[PDB]
């Protein structure tokens, strides 16, 4: 299946063939009551001193529990959970390019970043979110230092010369409609 | 940032004033260490470390959460191969005096976001602007050029002050003076 | 736009990355938020404290 | 007398906001409903619903 | 395509021993 699906489009194999080959199955939360669900094969089905050895199903990848804004977080398993929630919030506010036809939109409010960048570290999941095409942010050389103290209680010191070069410079479009 | 660290730009220092490594890499964003220890956004630190690996290695690091192929020690091992401290720390020099800072600073690429919450969209002031028609008090909100609500709780806080003259002015002479 | 190629979508001044799934009502993109509800046709037995009923088989 | 906000203006602010507004579910349970149990992350949301993406506000 | 080639060569490079550290830089459950 992996080899066939790697040449997909070239052989017009597809996910629907994984479904129609009895290889993957849509389980739903009430049927999930009755699956025994490994989490990866090499972890859970290998001949350790058996936990159950009766797995019916296996997680495809465990990061697929995350949604759209949460799966842009890198290493979310290394963060305190409320902070992943706060990112899932703020990730809906990060200026970027919100859509590539933005020059045709007369949206009432639009913020477009000049030089939005692709993250230097990504989840794989944000491939499918298409985040590397419409990214929202800049990889910046951050330093975690107290320095002059103007960054103290949840504040940041920015580089003025970087800003002069266009660092996070954005444009704000406001559309006024009258008939 | 992607890890629920949030903060207003507290000051901007030109490149001459920001601290610098051996090469003239000044940070773009300096965030206070105290953002980290109460919040334990260690995903932020690991992002910065692997971002510094990615930028030297010259390809985009993986931060998919549950990927046991990635760990901090493996990243540190890679980072040490490019001639940096394996934990991402660097000797910085104070931009003002040029002296080495005695503590080596954790510095590296991290993906920052700029949020829609810009300050010029929030700054607001009133000094006898438009008045409501029904009760001749200031209109509500910045867009209306309103006056801030001196609410109940502020009334209580000024009673506690015993600041009856400033309570009379706020709840009368600076709101709806009438006879 | 159904099945329409990226070339054509750009020719329509549409974005080939735009997902769809929203309506245009008088020019406003309106999404229908999926509304959660109790499942129909399924019996559920609940205890509702602070009532005369020890148990209640809802359907 | 009807339901309200079933149909919200698509959040074009940023593409992850558009994509997440389209994938958004909503419990009709009353906010200002003081109950915690409908707001808690139930074990059964595993793989169905993001354990992390929720409004930190009243919702 | 060159990324798929790089990934498959990295996959066979996953066969190398001693690429992990005893200082518990990560842990995984293995109960029962």
């Amino acid at each position: 299946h992996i080899d066939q699906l790697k040449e997909r489009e070239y052989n017009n194999y597809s996910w629907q063939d994984l479904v129609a080959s009895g290889v993957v199955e849509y389980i739903d939360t009430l049927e999930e009551e009755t699956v025994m669900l490994a989490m990866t094969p090499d972890d859970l089905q290998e001949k350790e001193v058996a936990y159950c050895s009766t797995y019916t199903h296996c997680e495809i990848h465990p990061s697929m529990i995350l949604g759209v804004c949460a799966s842009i977080i890198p290493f979310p398993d290394h963060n305190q959970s409320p902070r992943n929630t706060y990112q899932s919030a703020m990730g809906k506010q990060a200026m970027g390019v919100y859509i590539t036809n933005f020059h045709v939109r007369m949206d009432t409010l639009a913020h477009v970043l000049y030089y939005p960048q692709k993250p230097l570290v990504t989840t794989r999941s944000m491939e499918y979110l298409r985040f590397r095409e419409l990214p929202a942010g800049i990889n910046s050389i951050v330093a975690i230092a107290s320095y002059t103290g103007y960054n103290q209680e949840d504040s940041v010191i920015m580089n003025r010369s970087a800003v002069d070069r266009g660092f996070f410079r954005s444009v704000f479009y406001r559309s006024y409609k009258e008939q | 940032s992607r890890h629920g660290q949030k903060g207003t730009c507290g000051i901007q220092y030109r490149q001459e004033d920001m601290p610098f490594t051996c090469e003239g890499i000044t940070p773009d964003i300096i965030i206070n260490p105290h953002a980290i220890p109460s919040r334990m956004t260690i995903g932020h630190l690991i992002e910065c470390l692997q971002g510094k690996v990615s930028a030297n290695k010259g390809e985009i690091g993986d931060a998919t959460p549950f990927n046991d192929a990635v760990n901090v020690q493996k990243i540190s091992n890679l980072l040490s191969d490019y001639g940096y401290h394996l934990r991402g720390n660097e000797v910085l020099y104070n931009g003002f005096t040029g002296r080495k800072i005695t503590s080596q600073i954790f510095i590296g690429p991290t993906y920052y976001q700029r949020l829609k919450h810009m300050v010029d969209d929030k700054i607001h002031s009133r000094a006898r602007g438009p008045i409501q028609i029904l009760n001749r008090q200031p209109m509500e909100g910045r867009s209306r050029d309103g006056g801030l609500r001196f609410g109940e709780m502020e009334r209580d806080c000024q009673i506690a002050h015993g600041a009856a003259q400033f309570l009379r002015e706020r709840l009368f002479e600076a709101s709806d003076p009438y006879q | 736009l159904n099945g329409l190629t990226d070339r054509d979508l750009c020719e329509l001044n549409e974005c080939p990355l735009d997902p769809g799934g929203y309506f245009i009502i008088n020019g406003s993109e309106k999404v229908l938020i999926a509304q959660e509800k109790m499942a129909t046709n399924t019996v559920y037995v609940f205890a509702k404290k602070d009532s005369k009923y020890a148990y209640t088989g809802e359907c | 007398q009807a339901r309200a906000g079933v149909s919200q203006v698509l959040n074009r602010l940023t593409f992850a906001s558009t994509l997440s507004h389209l994938r958004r579910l909503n419990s009709p349970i009353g906010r200002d409903g003081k109950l915690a149990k409908p707001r808690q992350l139930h074990n059964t949301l595993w793989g169905m619903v993001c354990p992390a993406e929720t409004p930190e506000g009243h919702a | 395509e060159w990324n798929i080639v790089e990934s498959e060569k990295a996959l066979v490079a996953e066969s190398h021993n001693m690429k992990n550290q005893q200082m518990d830089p990560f842990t995984r459950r293995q109960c029962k």
Partner: peptide, 28 residues
């Protein structure tokens, strides 16, 4: 034959094929 670990590659050829077949808003 079975996937002899080296499974991460396979695991994201699946998923990738899913999101090819069912873009993110398929439920709408």
């Amino acid at each position: 034959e079975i996937t002899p670990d080296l499974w991460q590659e396979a695991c994201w050829i699946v998923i990738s094929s899913y999101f090819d077949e069912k873009g993110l808003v398929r439920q709408q």
